[PDB]
Subunit: 113 residues, 2 copies
Amino acid sequence: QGMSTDFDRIYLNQSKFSGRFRIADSGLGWKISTSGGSAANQARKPFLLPATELSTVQWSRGCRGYDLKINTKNQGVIQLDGFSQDDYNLIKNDFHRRFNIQVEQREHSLRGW
Amino acid sequence: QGMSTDFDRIYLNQSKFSGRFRIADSGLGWKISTSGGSAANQARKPFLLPATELSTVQWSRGCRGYDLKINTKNQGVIQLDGFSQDDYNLIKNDFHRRFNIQVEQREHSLRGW
Ligand SMILES: [Cl-]
Ligand SMILES: [Cl-]
């Protein structure tokens, strides 16, 4: 749809359901994405995190693939995982441009050597 | 050994190896614990995080069991996982007494309701 940057099959805080993660100028969103089409998917409500609540963001190792661990002003650290190594460049650019946040690279133990 | 509070089979940042996690007055430690006895275990060096680097700590959902996500002054967010629900009370008490840190309970979505 062309405004937000979207990623499918992402998990929020080790959720059993996967969902779609969206990066918008307004902040972040995540919504359960499943089967049943317009029954089950239509009742679902999004998790919405306003950009004002973002403080730091790191790209690190998830349970599934790579993750973002996102520290917030009022809601602790939120985890999104299920990313591919391929996703990093896009994520880095989006967080810089939309939020002026530099994503920290902390996904292996040789970082900073 | 009676000074530190120790937990076995804990993983650091989704490490392939598990190790022993130790909570001491001086800060946190983690060291790979494996087989071979005094060959492989003896060469291993610990990860050491001085108490001065601790800022916030939350108890949340790991890849394995429950986790701590620990925000540090200079090293981003560190994850320890592999904890049982049983571990929480001890952890809460140790972080309060040793560091004056209140562990945030953020391990399910009904927290704060
Ligand atoms: Cl947008
Ligand atoms: Cl001690």
